[PDB]
Structure 1
Amino acid sequence: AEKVLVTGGAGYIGSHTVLELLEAGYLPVVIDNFHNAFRGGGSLPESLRRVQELTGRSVEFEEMDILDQGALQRLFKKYSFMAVIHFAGLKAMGESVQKPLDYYRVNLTGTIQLLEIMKAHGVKNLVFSSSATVYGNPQYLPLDEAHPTGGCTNPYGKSKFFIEEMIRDLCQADKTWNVVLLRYFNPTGAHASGCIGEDPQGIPNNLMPYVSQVAIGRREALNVFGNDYDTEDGTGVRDYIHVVDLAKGHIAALRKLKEQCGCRIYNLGTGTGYSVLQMVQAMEKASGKKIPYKVVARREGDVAACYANPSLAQEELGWTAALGLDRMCEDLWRWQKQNPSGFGT
């Protein structure tokens, strides 16, 4: 009726989105099981506790797992939701290939359970966290929504594609459902306040947090996974997108659902690709620190270059990413410098 349910809202993208929702006047209800979120000193996960402080608005939260039908039932009885933004899931941490069942359980079974409860309670409006990984090895660049999908390299990406397909099927079968599938490119950056940001545990698998950790002195040097691709400089190229813009894209998705759009799919990227070395350099500039690097072997399954065609999202969702490279680096640096250990110990 009123509320927006946000699954996995304590995570990186989700917490930034909760913040945007609150500032836009929405009332979110967040759920998370702390699988990859840090527990604050109170009820709320630290990220959310900080979002509350930042917005001066309260965060309604419930600790729970999407795999728990009982809890889902109780949740859906307690609140009247008008839409669900689904961030909860396991992300490839490079782990996927080795633990397929965990991925398929959490991402597939958990999403199906969510979809079923939504259907049961008549909440047929969803915004889903998809990924450019669904396009597989790029056939052409930039990647537009019409590029082929499926034929993924890993259990994680396959999981994303399977979910998109299930949702398409659901929308076909029941014309009352509205779903916006958002294919994120490479999220980076952090809220301008520097109070929240990505909080990886252990050695980061993604570039940016590793880069930021070298700059802060936590890591000796960045290992660059190959310099022999068919890219202007030999290193992998990606469409780095500021998490704040990404979060704002979810609000635009909400408005889209109101149009009774059925199933729509949009890329959420800037359309500008940057190489590993370019990112390193920009981080040196932002941080004022040196970021030593070593060229190592190619990482299994890595693609040479991946970047988005942002046209459709601009035309249909009315959204474009506003923040550039320098801004992403400055914000990421601020978060890292201001929070040397992430959210806590």
Structure 2
Amino acid sequence: AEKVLVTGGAGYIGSHTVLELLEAGYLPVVIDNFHNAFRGGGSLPESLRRVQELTGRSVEFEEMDILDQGALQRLFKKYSFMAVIHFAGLKAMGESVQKPLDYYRVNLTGTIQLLEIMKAHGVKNLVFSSSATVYGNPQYLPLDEAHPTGGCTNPYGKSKFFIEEMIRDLCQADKTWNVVLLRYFNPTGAHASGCIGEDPQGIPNNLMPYVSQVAIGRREALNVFGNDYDTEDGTGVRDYIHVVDLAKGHIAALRKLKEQCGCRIYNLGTGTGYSVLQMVQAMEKASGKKIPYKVVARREGDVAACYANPSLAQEELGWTAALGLDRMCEDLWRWQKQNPSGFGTQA
């Protein structure tokens, strides 16, 4: 009977998570300001309109910015939330380094405000979207939760780190709060229906969408950012994790909250690292198309290799990433093929 508030719920990870919540019997209330989500023909973001169709369950949604104090207050007054899953924020589009204040305002002040509003309304259960970037340049691998944090590169990563810190202090000061900080690795793939997925606007900054776009025939070749790293093939290595697994990890996080767990931090990754070339190859296999690429200059601030140690999460969260590489690629391909130009309003 008590709701779960989902901020930034119309985005990539958020939409997939709303779907999992609905299927698991939860009742979400979703907010988003369309900063990086496509408007549908109706009131709902297209992503969520599709989630409603897929699940056969209604999606409760309000267009709203987490920076809008009054709206946020009214929302918390109107419903009785039992928890909040916070995805809303700015993510690097390689942008952060150039616009620190936007990241500090949206991510930092936006989250402080949300926490204040939560406290004031007696909602002290949170699931926070963190990231492997908080670990900075890996000092060792795989990255376990004990790996040093902070020392992050850009404003985006620092914003995530500062937020983690704040929540940690909050839990320390008030034993009644429960917060699960989830450090995601590299989310990829799409819901198996092929109806929703990652919907980038313009030239994708991330690997996977660029690859699929080449495979679909929109882009000519993949620009590989350096091949001189200290890795097996010289190309960057990352722990790619299926968005569906990631979304399910959120449900696990809600259950953890119910245990009155205090502050907990978990990596959400598969524990397996793949290089850029390995991802291209898997995409060629999924797509049944050759995927050309060209090696270009390294990208500023890029790390050589990053991958998780997912044992804490398996142990404490009762969660593991069930989907493999081919699944990720096949699911991404399905979304891409069925939606050559991403989301669009209904015909």
TM-score per shorter chain, which class?
Answer: over 0.9
In the TM superposition, what is the alpha-carbon distance from 1:344 to its structure 2 partner? Answer: 1.9
Give the aligned CA root-mean-square deviation in angstroms.
0.6
Q: 2-side partners of 1:286 and 1:78: how far apart?
A: 46
CA distances 1:100-125 after superposition (whole Å, capped 9, x unpaired): 11111000010000000000001000
CA distances 1:155-195 after superposition (whole Å, capped 9, x unpaired): 00000000000000110111100000000000000000000
Q: 2-side partners of 1:73 and 1:325: how far apart?
A: 42
Q: 2-side partners of 1:122 and 1:325: how far apart?
A: 42
Q: 2-side partners of 1:202 and 1:99: how far apart?
A: 19
Confirm whether residue 4 of structure 1 aligns to residue 11 of structure 2.
no
In the TM superposition, what is the alpha-carbon distance from 1:289 to its structure 2 partner? Answer: 1.1
Q: 1-side partners of 2:289 and 2:56: how far apart?
A: 34
What TM-score does the superposition give when structure 1 sets the normalisation length? 0.99
Q: 2-side partners of 1:344 and 1:301: how far apart?
A: 34
Q: 1-side partners of 2:70 and 2:305: how far apart?
A: 43
Q: 2-side partners of 1:169 and 1:67: how far apart?
A: 22
Is the partner of 1:342 in helix, strand or coil? coil
In the TM superposition, what is the alpha-carbon distance from 1:311 to its structure 2 partner? Answer: 0.4
CA distances 1:59-108 after superposition (whole Å, capped 9, x unpaired): 00000000001001110111110000000000001000111111110000
Q: 1-side partners of 2:290 and 2:117: how far apart?
A: 51
User: What is the number of residues matched between the two proteins?
Assistant: 345
Quote the residue 2:174 is aligned against: 174
Q: 1-side partners of 2:75 and 2:88: how far apart?
A: 15
Q: 1-side partners of 2:45 and 2:136: how far apart?
A: 34
In the TM superposition, what is the alpha-carbon distance from 1:268 to its structure 2 partner? Answer: 0.1
Q: 1-side partners of 2:225 and 2:46: how far apart?
A: 33
Quote the residue 1:82 is aligned against: 82
In the TM superposition, what is the alpha-carbon distance from 1:235 to its structure 2 partner? Answer: 0.2
Q: 1-side partners of 2:291 and 2:80: how far apart?
A: 49
Is the partner of 2:341 in helix, strand or coil? strand
Gap regions ≥5 residues in structure 1 = none
Quote the residue 2:154 is aligned against: 154
In the TM superposition, what is the alpha-carbon distance from 1:290 to its structure 2 partner? Answer: 1.3
Q: 1-side partners of 2:199 and 2:282: how far apart?
A: 21
Is the partner of 1:340 in helix, strand or coil? coil
CA distances 1:225-273 after superposition (whole Å, capped 9, x unpaired): 1111111111000000000000000000000000100000000000000
Quote the residue 1:273 is aligned against: 273
Confirm whether residue 261 of structure 1 aligns to residue 261 of structure 2.
yes
Q: Which runs of 4+ in 1 moved over 6 A?
A: none
Q: 1-side partners of 2:73 and 2:184: how far apart?
A: 30
Between the two proteins, what is the percent identity of the paired residues? 100
Q: 2-side partners of 1:259 and 1:124: how far apart?
A: 13
Q: 2-side partners of 1:336 and 1:286: how far apart?
A: 11
Q: 2-side partners of 1:95 and 1:290: how far apart?
A: 31
Quote the residue 1:60 is aligned against: 60
Gap regions ≥5 residues in structure 2 = none
Q: 1-side partners of 2:110 and 2:82: how far apart?
A: 20
